[PDB]
Design a binder for this molecule. Structure first.
Ligand SMILES: OC[C@@H](O)[C@H](O)[C@@H](O)CO
Ligand SMILES: [Ca+2]
Length: 297
């Protein structure tokens, strides 16, 4: 009953940060090196893009209206109507060549996002240059920890007491104790160790049963994980190797959207993966996800 299909054939270089906007039945996402934030209306099937002036690594809903995004090393606010973009806060000012990577809004409306050194090739970069940050609703920025290689997938337990986090080049999914009222975290530990054939852990989202789904970059799959036991529950393969992230969307969050990349593929790889860069949808997983939180500033 599980069905994997390519639903948007736009050939992004590195599709990332899919977010479901139920108010419009649209998928928001980015194409990082193409410097565009995209909004795909799934019913009219039209895509609108907002071009920005540096690589844009994530996008999130903004409660008061419009969107927020991480552009370069800056948290930014976007008005979709006039396409105006302005800076809310900047991080890593002491770094010569960093950028934000994955980000997501916590259950209290704080925009978490972490950084990385810029790559010369996939996973080829100066080590330990990133940090995890969050933009609070008052536009202040909290720095959580440094020494990150590539800040990636992240989400929160349904009871709002645990934060899950991926630094891609650590090859583990980690968990922290998390305090909803203050946004503080502590007690970092490993909850899943990636197997060799699962390649690089990238984006991540939680489902309604508290299990984690992780996109496996170079692994051509998403895997479902139980963070309580440390065991993989399920693998769903896709016809593209560089699967980057995933989120739930559609009616009652019953469908999974998966982004992927064509950057880093050679000519042979492009031919073997004609849908590299496209958006996929997975139906029939038999579990639902949850709605994204909106930034509260
Ligand atoms: O395997 C990770 C990729 O190399 C990155 O460039 C992405 O930005 C991660 O989201
Ligand atoms: Ca990613």
């Amino acid at each position: 009953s599980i069905k994997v299909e390519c639903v948007l054939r736009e050939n992004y270089r590195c599709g990332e940060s899919p977010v479901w906007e139920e108010a419009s039945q649209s998928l928001l996402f980015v194409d990082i090196p193409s410097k565009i934030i995209c909004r795909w209306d799934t019913v009219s099937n039209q895509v609108q893009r907002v071009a920005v002036d540096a690589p844009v690594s994530s996008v999130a809903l903004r409660q008061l209206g419009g969107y927020v995004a991480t552009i370069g090393t800056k948290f930014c606010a976007l008005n979709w109507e006039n396409q105006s973009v302005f800076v809310l806060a900047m991080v890593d000012e002491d770094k010569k060549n960093n950028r934000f990577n994955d980000g997501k809004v916590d259950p209290a409306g704080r925009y978490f996002a972490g950084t990385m050194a810029e790559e010369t090739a996939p996973a080829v970069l100066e080590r330990h240059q990133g940090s995890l940050y969050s933009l609070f609703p008052d536009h202040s920025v909290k720095k959580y920890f440094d020494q990150v290689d590539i800040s990636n997938g992240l989400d929160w337990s349904l009871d709002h007491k645990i934060f899950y986090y991926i630094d891609s080049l650590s090859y583990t999914v980690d968990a922290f104790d998390y305090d909803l009222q203050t946004g503080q975290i502590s007690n970092r530990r490993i909850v899943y160790k990636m197997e060799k054939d699962e390649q690089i852990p990238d984006g991540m989202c939680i489902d309604a049963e508290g299990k984690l789904w992780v996109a496996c970059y170079n692994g051509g799959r998403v895997i479902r994980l139980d963070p309580e036991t440390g065991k993989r529950l399920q693998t769903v393969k896709l016809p593209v190797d560089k699967t980057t992230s995933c989120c739930f969307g559609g009616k009652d969050y019953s469908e999974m959207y998966v982004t992927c990349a064509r950057d880093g593929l050679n000519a042979e790889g492009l031919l073997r993966q004609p849908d590299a860069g496209n958006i996929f949808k997975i139906t029939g997983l038999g579990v639902k996800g949850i709605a994204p939180y909106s930034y509260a500033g």
